[PDB]
């Protein structure tokens, strides 16, 4: 038993062993896993074992995929029987809105290896004989997946792990972690102490518990979930093939073949289900493990009834087992995966809702991150720092109670959920604007989506096609192009960075040149291999003092990188996160100057207040820092101010521009605006998937700036070889629907790429999409076909930009 570990993993469940297997197979030395009692003693052993190629999301299709592919090679690897049953999986549409969901999911899977099929009821009768075909309209089918034995899965990964040099001590629970100023760790088991260069928390529902050992709120809550096992069924025994795993979405239950009977479990109402609040307040009772909850069948009876109806053999069969167990839910049901910001060398893999299908893939992910220094592909959706102080256990219970219940609701585009809202993270502006718009949840913040025109509909109305906020966004669009309008942009991520090494810090953290004093420019942080880890505004205020602006979802994601690089290069700087004390305000449109000039004594002429210049001034004797910048592409300023002034400032500006007919606007409006200027959004046109040259960002990337910035020589290798694909811009005539991004694009039979984002263009009266395509298909004038809701629409690459920006005009 060694006293210096390279990587220590707290957890012997199936996600901990996943990481040990992959880290050790990758050749990491001294991998050490510490478990409280025994492997699989957590949630894992009792799991229903369902493993599907299917995911509603986008990049999570790759986690599921990487898992399934590994799980196959695993008997062959270890000598052990993992218990992988692979009949296929089939989600049922029983309503027509559900057929629509399937068409929307299929266009999103087309540009993925994940092989997926929209199938007829005839192919489901042949596939699942005992099924009631009476209301079934269609099915979503993935061949090559099904379920697996969690025990046999975990043990098989351990044998792979041990065999490649991972040491798996148990029982040896951590009782104490102490951070060391040199970035290492001190772990404390009842066996003794040891030092790991990094630590990985994979402690299931104890994750929150262990996180506190180094003073962290991990927003996780154990949830009660039951499933049911029947006795043998004669018609089930009589089938020659194994039934494919079903999901009657409209009943909200999954079902599968267990031996010669049926295993099924529902997701009860968010009002009906139970959570382990007591375990967050008091912590998990010690001496818990290899252990279940008392069943509560009566609370899911409504759902059993439905199950009996879709599959009538159940009406006769008998129940053998009711497994009521705990699962670790984060607020949005997604796991928290990656290095935790604020603490050095602490990674997490916690809050897994679907840990058995996620384990393999998440293990290859984290491991490829540890051993490379950057994520292999982009999963900011899974990023552990997407939460914050606002993610209080109050909120954490509410939305998690929702994520459960909403497991099988219809996955709409621009989906909105209201559990736990609003949060503590709100600008003074919120209370002003709430009564007059639809507020979209972004990173805890409440920020408007679209503003209510009077006499027109204001209910929440999601759809796969154009919906009730269509023309209001048009009026908003028309508003900013004609006059002047104000949007709230307080959610931005905001970093101030002063100190002696700061230009040495930013000049290597960024690919663009460092802006002259009193200026701003758009800069990207590349990963060492060349992907766009982040885009953000670099404002240069006092010589050597910088203000960094970024997106609300990409705030702590981006800070973490800046912090770590300051640590690695041993930079002498100071970085504070001023994000919450500042409110932001965009004022954009032709009339911005006429309106803002009358509120300030500062000269706002185009000659005097240049584009991208930053300046300190007072708007109505309210101290503000104004940047001549706008994501709209229209004449405009961003006014950064203290959170208290937001109302007083907003009011002054509204009052002021009443002469020019000033009005409000929001993000939905803002999308349509920027897309016409062909502006790229990080996380959309670009993220860790993409490098800046192929995303058409050559403009912001000075490959001959003297500094060997993070990612330079990588890029120089890309530029030298030449791109394989390039980001283009398309228009298309649609009927009733617009693209939003992640729709597949077709050329003469094959799928050849995808759209990253879309919108209707209110000025040319067509639709607009950004898209990745082969270079042979990337010329201006080139036609492609874009899959939108089951129908292919012809689209054609235009010369970008559609609308010139005010300075270029
Ligand atoms: C309850 C349940 C879960 C479930 C399911 C059905 C039911 C009824 N069906 C699933 C499915 O169809 N598909 C799927 O992918 N997952 C399903 N799940 C459950 C869940 O996703 C998984 O069980 C997931 O693995 C969660 O487990 P995780 O890998 O995160 O870890 P764990 O097994 O819960 O336990 C972690 C281990 O760490 C040890 N520990 C705890 N405290 C300490 C300290 N202080 N020091 C060291 N080690 C510690 C625990 O002993 C535990 O073994």
Curated annotation (Swiss-Prot):
Q: Does the keyword Flavoprotein apply?
A: yes
PTM-bearing positions, type Tele-8alpha-FAD histidine: 46
Q: Which UniProt keywords apply?
A: Acetylation, Disease variant, FAD, Flavoprotein, Mitochondrion, Oxidoreductase, Transit peptide
Residues that hold FAD according to the record: 14-15, 35-36, 42-50, 174, 206, 352-357
Q: Which disease is it linked to?
A: DMGDH deficiency: Disorder characterized by fish odor, muscle fatigue with increased serum creatine kinase. Biochemically it is characterized by an increase of N,N-dimethylglycine (DMG) in serum and urine.
The UniProt similarity line reads: Belongs to the GcvT family.
Q: What is the recorded name of this protein? A: Dimethylglycine dehydrogenase, mitochondrial
Annotated organism of origin:
Homo sapiens
Q: Write the lineage as a comma-separated list.
A: Eukaryota, Metazoa, Chordata, Craniata, Vertebrata
């Amino acid at each position: 038993w060694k006293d210096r570990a390279e990587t220590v993993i707290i957890g012997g469940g199936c996600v901990g062993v996943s990481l040990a297997y992959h880290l050790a197979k990758a050749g990491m030395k001294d991998v050490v896993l510490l478990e409280k009692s025994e492997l699989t003693a957590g949630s894992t052993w009792h799991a229903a074992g369902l493993t599907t190629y299917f995911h509603p999301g986008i990049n999570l299709k790759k986690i599921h995929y990487d898992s399934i592919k590994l799980y196959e090679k695993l008997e062959e690897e270890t000598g052990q029987v993992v218990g992988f049953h692979q009949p296929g999986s089939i989600r049922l549409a029983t309503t027509p809105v559900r057929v629509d969901e399937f068409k929307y999911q299929m266009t999103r899977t087309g540009w993925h290896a994940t092989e997926q099929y929209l199938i007829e009821p005839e192919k489901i009768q042949e596939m699942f004989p005992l099924l009631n075909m009476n209301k079934v309209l269609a099915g979503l089918y993935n061949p090559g997946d099904g379920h697996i034995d969690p025990y046999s899965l975990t043990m098989a990964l351990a044998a792979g792990a041990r065999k490649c040099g991972a040491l798996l001590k148990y029982p040896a629970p951590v009782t104490s972690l102490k951070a060391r100023s040199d970035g290492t760790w001190d772990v404390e088991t009842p066996q003794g102490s040891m030092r790991a260069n990094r630590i990985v928390n994979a402690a299931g529902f104890w994750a929150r518990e262990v996180g506190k050992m180094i003073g962290l709120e991990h927003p996780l809550i154990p949830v009660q979930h039951q499933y049911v096992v029947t006795s043998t069924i004669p018609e089930v025994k009589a089938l020659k093939r194994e039934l494919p795993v079903l999901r009657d979405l409209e009943g909200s239950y999954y079902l599968r073949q267990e031996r010669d009977g049926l295993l099924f479990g529902p997701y009860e109402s968010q009002e009906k289900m139970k959570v382990q609040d007591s375990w967050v307040t008091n912590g998990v009772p010690p001496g818990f493990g290899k252990e279940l909850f008392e069943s509560d069948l009566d609370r899911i009876m409504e759902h059993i009834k439905a199950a009996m109806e879709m599959v009538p053999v159940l009406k006769k069969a008998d129940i053998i087992n009711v497994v009521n167990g705990p699962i670790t839910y984060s607020p949005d049901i997604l796991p928290m995966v990656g290095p935790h910001q604020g603490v050095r060398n602490y990674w997490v893999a916690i809050g897994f809702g679907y840990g058995i299908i996620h384990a393999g893939g998440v293990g290859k992910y984290l491991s490829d991150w540890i051993l490379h220094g950057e994520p292999p592909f982009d999963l900011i959706e899974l990023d552990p720092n997407r939460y914050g102080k606002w993610t209080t256990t109050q909120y954490t219970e509410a939305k998690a109670r929702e994520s459960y219940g909403f497991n099988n609701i219809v996955g709409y585009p621009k989906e909105e959920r209201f559990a736990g809202r609003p949060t503590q993270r709100v600008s003074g502006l919120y209370q002003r604007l709430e009564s007059k718009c639809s507020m979209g949840f972004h990173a805890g913040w409440e920020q408007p989506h679209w503003f209510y025109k009077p006499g027109q509909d204001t209910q929440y109305r999601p759809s796969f096609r154009r919906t009730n906020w269509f023309e209001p966004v048009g009026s908003e669009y028309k508003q900013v192009m004609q006059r002047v309008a104000v949007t709230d942009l307080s959610p931005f991520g905001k970093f101030n960075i002063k100190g002696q090494d700061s230009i040495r810090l930013l000049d290597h953290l960024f690919a663009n040149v460092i802006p002259k004093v009193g200026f701003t420019n758009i800069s990207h942080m590349l990963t060492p291999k060349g992907r766009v880890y982040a885009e953000l505004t670099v404002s240069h205020q006092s010589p050597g003092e910088f203000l960094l602006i970024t997106g609300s979802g990409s705030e702590l994601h981006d800070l973490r990188w800046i912090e770590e690089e300051a640590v690695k290069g041993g930079y002498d700087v100071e970085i504070k996160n001023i994000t919450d004390e500042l409110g932001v305000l965009g004022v954009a449109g032709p009339q911005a100057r006429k309106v803002l000039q009358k509120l300030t004594s500062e000269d706002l002429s185009d000659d005097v207040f240049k584009f991208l210049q930053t300046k300190s001034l007072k708007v109505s004797n309210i101290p503000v820092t104004a940047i001549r910048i706008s994501y709209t592409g229209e004449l405009g300023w961003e006014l950064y101010h203290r959170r208290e002034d937001s109302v007083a400032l907003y009011d002054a500006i509204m009052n002021a521009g009443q002469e020019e007919g000033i009005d409000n606007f929001g993000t939905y409006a803002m999308n349509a605006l920027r897309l016409e200027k062909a502006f790229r959004a990080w996380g959309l046109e670009m993220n860790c998937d993409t490098n800046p040259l192929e995303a058409g960002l050559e403009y912001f990337v000075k490959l001959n700036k003297p500094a060997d910035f993070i990612g330079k020589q990588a890029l120089k290798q890309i530029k030298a070889k030449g791109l394989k694909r390039r980001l283009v811009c398309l228009t298309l005539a649609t009927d009733d629907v617009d693209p939003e991004g992640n729709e597949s694009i077709w050329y003469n039979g094959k799928v050849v790429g995808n759209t990253t984002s879309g919108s209707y263009s209110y000025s040319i009266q067509k639709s607009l999409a950004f898209a990745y395509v082969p270079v042979q298909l990337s010329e201006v004038g080139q036609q492609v076909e874009v899959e939108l809701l089951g129908k292919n629409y012809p689209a054609v690459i235009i010369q970008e930009p559609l609308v010139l920006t005010e300075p270029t005009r």
